Amino acid sequence: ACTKNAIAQTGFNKDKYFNGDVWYVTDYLDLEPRYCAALAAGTASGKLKEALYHYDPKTQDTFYDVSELQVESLGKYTANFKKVDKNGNVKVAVTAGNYYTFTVMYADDSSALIHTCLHKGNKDLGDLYAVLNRNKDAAAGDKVKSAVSAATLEFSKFISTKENNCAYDNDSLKSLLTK
Ligand code: HEM
Numbered sequence: 742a743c744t745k746n747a748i749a750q751t752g753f754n755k756d757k758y759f760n761g762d763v764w765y766v767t768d769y770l771d772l773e774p775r776y777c778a779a780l781a782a783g784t785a786s787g788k789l790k791e792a793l794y795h796y797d798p799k800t801q802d803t804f805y806d807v808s809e810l811q812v813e814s815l816g817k818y819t820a821n822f823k824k825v826d827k828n829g830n831v832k833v834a835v836t837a838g839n840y841y842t843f844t845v846m847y848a849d850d851s852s853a854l855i856h857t858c859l860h861k862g863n864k865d866l867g868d869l870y871a872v873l874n875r876n877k878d879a880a881a882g883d884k885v886k887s888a889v890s891a892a893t894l895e896f897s898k899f900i901s902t903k904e905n906n907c908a909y910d911n912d913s914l915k916s917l918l919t920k
Pocket residue numbers: 766768769775776777778780793795804805806822823824833840841843857859861864871902
């Protein structure tokens with residue numbers, strides 16, 4: 742189960758974060774303990790949208806999702822996801838009880854720290870923190886590392902995705918925002 746009420750960044754700039762571009766997960770911290778992951782976040786016809794990509798570089802398990810985000814407060818969202826192929830074709834429809842929360846704890850032009858809590862079926866899932874960068878496999882800079890510290894988290898405990906053989910379809914993620 743999830744246990745954290747993540748606090749959103751003071752002065753979070755939603756237009757900057759939800760600008761339609763891609764964010765790569767570079768490091769993650771599972772509170773209830775290996776995929777590569779990335780997302781696009783943007784607006785489509787006035788709605789906040791995210792497209793997600795997960796890839797397991799060992800098993801090859803791959804899946805995409807599209808979500809409309811509902812606002813709880815600035816920088817804190819609830820998202821109902823639908824599983825899609827890379828083209829946006831629906832594989833699993835939206836269903837009540839299948840959702841994640843998403844909190845942006847820190848963001849700037851190139852980096853972010855987020856918290857997410859996934860609810861899926863009758864699985865018992867836990868909190869996940871992720872460091873994001875606009876550039877694939879970029880080493881975490883001083884600003885986001887300081888934000889990790891300021892959140893009372895130990896960055897050395899995070900797991901890096903940067904050494905995995907992952908490729909990302911940026912074009913697909915961006916186009917999924919409209920789906
Ligand atoms: C490297 C970071 C991440 C890892 C290692 C990871 C791992 C996983 C795993 C193993 C699953 C399968 C769960 C199951 O069905 O048993 C999953 C599903 C999911 N994750 Fe992540 N995840 C990561 C990042 C994220 C992020 C940042 C988000 C949201 C912004 C997210 C949202 C989701 C959603 C919505 C599903 C269910 C998708 C579906 O069934 O259609 N994940 N993740």
